[PDB]
Amino acid sequence: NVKPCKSMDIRNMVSHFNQLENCTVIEGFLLIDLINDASPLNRSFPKLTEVTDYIIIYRVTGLHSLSKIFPNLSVIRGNKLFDGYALVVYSNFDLMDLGLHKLRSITRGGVRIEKNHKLCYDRTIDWLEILAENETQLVVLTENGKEKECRLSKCPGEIRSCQLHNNRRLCWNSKLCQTKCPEKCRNNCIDEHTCCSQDCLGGCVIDKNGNESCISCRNVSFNNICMDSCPKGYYQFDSRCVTANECITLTKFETNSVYSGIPYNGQCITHCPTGYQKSENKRMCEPCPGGKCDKECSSGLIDSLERAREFHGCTIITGTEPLTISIKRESGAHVMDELKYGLAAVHKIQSSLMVHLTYGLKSLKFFQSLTEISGDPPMDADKYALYVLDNRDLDELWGPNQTVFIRKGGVFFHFNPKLCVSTINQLLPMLASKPKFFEKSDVGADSNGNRGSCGTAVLNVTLQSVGANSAMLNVTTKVEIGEPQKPSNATIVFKDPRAFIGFVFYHMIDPYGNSTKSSDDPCDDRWKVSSPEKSGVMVLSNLIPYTNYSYYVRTMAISSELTNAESDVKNFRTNPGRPSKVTEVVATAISDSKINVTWSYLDKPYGVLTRYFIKAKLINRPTRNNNRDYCTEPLVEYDDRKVQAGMEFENALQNFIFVPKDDENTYKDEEDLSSNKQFYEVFAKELPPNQTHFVFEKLRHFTRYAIFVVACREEIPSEKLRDTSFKKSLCSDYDTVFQTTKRKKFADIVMDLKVDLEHANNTESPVRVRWTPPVDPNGEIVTYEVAYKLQKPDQVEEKKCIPAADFNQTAGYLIKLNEGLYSFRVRANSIAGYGDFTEVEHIKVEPPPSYAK
């Protein structure tokens, strides 16, 4: 009837696919994984109707349809979700029919059918019917069809079976449309018209008569009885009920790790509830005996991070043989990350602890909760409880304020070249013997710390000057070079003047100032580092203005001098200097009178911007080569190796010898009207630095203006009175933008237009046209164009081009005409363009006189 399977992990050897047979419920989840070619699947599994947990179909290839595998899938309950999803179908490049056609309920969580490049027909299902309604935010479908089609596939019945739905159709493929159940159904039934009884889930099947049975039934099942809840002594497990002892036969798989079923509260549960633990008879839950529950694990070698992971969530480490942290791989800084993951939860190493050959390991900080090493069977004939050998890079033991009581045996430390003896001597309060000291035989004094920065004193460094691009660092500490005077306040004394090579200054740009000193990892190269400077005054240089910098100092000495000192990291900031040029300055002509200038300060300010200074300078009017006449067209270490060699030679020598353009000064608000009071020749304004648009007014019609934009920052107190501001530099550089304003309408109208005959005796009538040159033109007049027309049809209007070089000296242009009444009108042409004519003037030209009447 309802025979189950546990979880399944299907694999490319398709003989693994045969695991699905003769069980209708997967009692856990389905993974189908990396079948490189599923084509040899001759089988199908229509017996499979239900999965309790979730489906993953991941990178299956040689597979074309899920109907091929498990076509009768009717319910995925979601009694777990994978990351919130009950159905993941990911990157199945060959998957092309999502033929889950009988699928009715995904009772919890979301659906994610994506990257299946051949799976058309994904949005073509209204997944929201299949889910529970609360989950309808959790349907995700992407990359279903990068290049396969441009809407070329089609549903059943529709023209590019079922009615129209969502004003499209709902489609599993080109063949099948989404099964319904009535609105008062809820995906527990399997025809469009008449749902099953409401005790069912997914669907029901009706016998050859009319007896109706569930495919899956909702609240629980036992003996295939559709049930509200399991009877007393039957324990619920996701879908069916089980006997008490049967629960222990069950499993569920989590976090890549097995859990048994434990029968509690009338349920199988994979974990006892928080504050309870699995009983000793592995079949019942009990309270944590201490009120806290503590996973107990077995001691062994930890040769690799991939091994260290096995301890995750362990709290007690147990067994007759030492936990042995032996990360021989020079892995580097991630060693602490995986070790912290593996071991940070340990309370108690019963076995004693060994730390051997490990390269990457900086410290035992990763035992972030270790508080006892009970040493019930300590190493080397119970002699040592904590054995720390050959650890090249180990230089710290436990965390700050970390206590770890060691009950039995001593501690053995050798060949840890960076582990300072004075750090090992922090364990003295921690042994049960509370011993006064460690013997040479336990803690080798020459074997530990012979390259640690041990006994480091503290230097005080002060920023004695600053620039925009430089700084002076002075080491204020009385570092005494050569032996002291006894009363001296000598903080550190280098007993040999030449053992001290110099101070080394470290600095970096660090806006937050939360940086910390460089570790000994040469890949930790966050810091610029000076040559050693023996004066202790270093003028840092080429700094970025107004930038938060951090710096620190250490003394550098030959490898065999144990005196050393080192500052904390100190923070400072450079002066703001000169703010960068303003950007995007564009000038657009509005009219003959107005300009809109747009800009935005993209490059960074230094300090705080205080003003944008806008200045417009009127360029001279244009002028053009009238000799190139254009009536035709006016229109518009060795620090050790060589030093030590020097030391011992000089010692040997001495033993032998002695045997008994507008400078920003000018940036000020201005108005400079021209003499006519009509327009500006200069305009300037110190706009608020919040504004990046400016509108000019009363500009001279048709002229080019140069436009600055300048961003300025506040002056520093030392500048405004100690520099006397003479270095200035408060204000940016600028680029001269230009714009030409616009032509003033009708400004080129010739005024006072008059036309008359001269009275001198003539045969061809001397018509004189007079005017005054335009009083305020759009720039220099090229020519006047006079247009005149005899006032009848079939006449073209004549035009003459008269250079402006003629009209004043003529004081009136003279034209010859004969009998007729003529239109006259005139316009000037500027080098800006043709003007607009006057209204038409008229003249009656009288006829050539005659006397033969």
């Binding site: 001495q654 033993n655 045997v659």
Partner: peptide, 25 residues
């Protein structure tokens, strides 16, 4: 042995009355 200023002083921590022993001319 010990026959020079770098043994007597320096690592030998001489007194000034010893240091003058090299100057006596």
């Amino acid at each position: 042995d010990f026959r020079g200023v770098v043994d007597s002083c320096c690592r030998n921590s001489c007194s000034f009355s010893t240091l003058r022993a090299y100057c006596d001319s």
